[PDB]
Design a protein around this nucleic acid. Sequence first.
RNA 1: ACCAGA
RNA 2: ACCAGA
RNA 3: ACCAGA
RNA 4: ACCAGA
RNA 5: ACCAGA
Lengths: 52, 363, 363
Amino acid sequence: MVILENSIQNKFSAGSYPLLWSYAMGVGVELENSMGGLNFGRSYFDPAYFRL
Amino acid sequence: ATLLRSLALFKRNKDKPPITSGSGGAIRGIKHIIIVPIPGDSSITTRSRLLDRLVRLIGNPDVSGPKLTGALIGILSLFVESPGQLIQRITDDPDVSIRLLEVVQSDQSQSGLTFAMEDEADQYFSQSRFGWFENKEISDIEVQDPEGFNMILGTILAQIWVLLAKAVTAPDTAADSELRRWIKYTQQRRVVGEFRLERKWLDVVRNRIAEDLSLRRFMVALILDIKRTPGNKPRIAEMICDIDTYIVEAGLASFILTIKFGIETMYPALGLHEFAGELSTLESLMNLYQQMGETAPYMVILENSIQNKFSAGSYPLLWSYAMGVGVELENSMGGLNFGRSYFDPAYFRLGQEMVRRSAGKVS
Amino acid sequence: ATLLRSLALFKRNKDKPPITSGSGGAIRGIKHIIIVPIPGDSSITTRSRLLDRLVRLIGNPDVSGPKLTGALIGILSLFVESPGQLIQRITDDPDVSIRLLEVVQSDQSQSGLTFAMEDEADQYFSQSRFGWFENKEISDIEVQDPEGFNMILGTILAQIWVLLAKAVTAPDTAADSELRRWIKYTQQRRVVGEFRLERKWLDVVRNRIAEDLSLRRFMVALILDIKRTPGNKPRIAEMICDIDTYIVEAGLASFILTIKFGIETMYPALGLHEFAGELSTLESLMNLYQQMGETAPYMVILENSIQNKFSAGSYPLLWSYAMGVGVELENSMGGLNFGRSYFDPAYFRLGQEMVRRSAGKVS
RNA sequence: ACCAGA
RNA sequence: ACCAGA
RNA sequence: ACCAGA
RNA sequence: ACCAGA
RNA sequence: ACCAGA
């Protein structure tokens, strides 16, 4: 949907769930080495749940 | 227990949309001829010349109400084959009669365009107060390739459709928000980054979309026609339905955020009896929202009479609780202005208190 | 006996860490772009050249606040594969935004390094006031083998991490103590003994670690990341966690030595009633110390607000008793400066008296 | 805030 | 209301 | 929008 | 009516 | 009969 770049990939964006996404980046970068290279820079990050 | 279902039916009739088709036809207003210059002929070249002579028409302090709305309806539908059967397909506005005129290119006219009336077109299309691009080294944006015009028109439309998102809700403080969408369509390679129309061109259009109502009814009702297109949409039309995620529910966030923070979190401060009557007049507004159909996220863009019913004044206590839950959870809710004459901050402080008490307090 | 548990709960709430996550996001300060020159590419050769051009960058009176902190964060993370995903892994400082730039080697540039901006790097990296090694026969420390650079970088880091131990507590009188750790890592064959950076290079860094706070938050929070590494740590990282035993609790020794000498010896002069209230506000500081987690031995290195609570001014009598027990037992406690405006030497002399009375006096 | 700590 | 509190 | 994936 | 939303 | 209600 984002290769075809349709309008419905705005709906799967992490901005609609900005807290539970940051929690999953906190679980994510602590578990795998591979998640350390993922850039997650957004204007809704809220790092208090990333640290949680 | 006969009072309970007699109470719930009482709120499913006074909070019900009125049945229609009772007017025989004596409500229709006095009409108003508007002038929408549609692209002339099959060829790509004249519709790029039409876009060029009609963007700088808008950046002009001498254009009127109808001439500007017809200029915008003229460029918001250049992205289709035969725009004439799109305007009369979309416009069901009762206060505006489309009299749309074909524009063909010429080498006799001054502007380069005649009407299919050779010099009469020059009074239709024609320095520090003319709105134009920010890189004002640009003189003309007339091109001859189809994919060139497809990217220039997609650039001009993508910064007129983002105006609609908060032309009527936050008109003045929309300059910082709409730039963040211009940055979005630049790194997606949707638009070209060079052809950014300036602050003064967009403030003509944003003031126009705010001040008349038949332009918004055209902008809403073609978005609703973009959504119904089943297959792969054309790429400017996909972009309009992509901008649409910022235009939907824009002005209902005293109701959407009341659902998102007051209802869906389910703190123990919803079993208060003072909310128990206001969870039912918010339950009936969720029944009413989905039976209004696909025109329901645009009720304050279209500015109909039913957006007074979704106002937070009908649930002034449970709304304030949800602003208290809201501004304590997100950084983004700190910028929301909620200044109303029914605020009651004792439940706003009760809304913040349920979040702070339930910090590490898994249910 | 209802006053007793009402008293103990009174001291387990005013001496309690405040609950958090109440700020929506409107506390975050104005940011500050810092420049951390990360090593460029997989190859060992450019990160030895980066270390060479960035050690002598620090020994320079013309470097600023941010340029020096970004130089130190640039060299304190050269010991890992891909230092770029370490800086953005560690830094949760709200006052500093890392803008880290890759540095690749070149033969075109003057210094030998460009940015992945060929000559713009030469104004980034560039005699009696340039800080450098004590054996200043050295010109360059660029090497080409991996185990050579692993021992040179381990030598440079082992005398920057020992600066952190008392950069903020005893900054001036740290010159004799930090040499005793340099002697420790020389006979362990951890470092090379030749490459001792001089007094004037380290006094740039020790003054820097003292005067800004976001450098210490990077130095602390990577130490806390070294500890979490489960298996055999890499050998420079093992050395940093080896230096760490001198950095922990550094500035809490009016509290650690109060526990060690006042509490744990258990002389009969703890059943004084004047201490009975101050053994409970020291019991609650031991409950508070272990529920702050792994950031608790660094509370005065990080200089947070909770190290005012572990101060000896809240227990000014039982602390002085423990300085009296302390300086009478060890030779090493004779060098400790305890000069405070709450000393009360009548309990310091009572602290020494319990040691002298209990000389051969097995309990 | 200040000691000693292979 | 009043002290001391890296 | 960004990681890793015989 | 006002926030954030690849 | 009296309020508030983009």
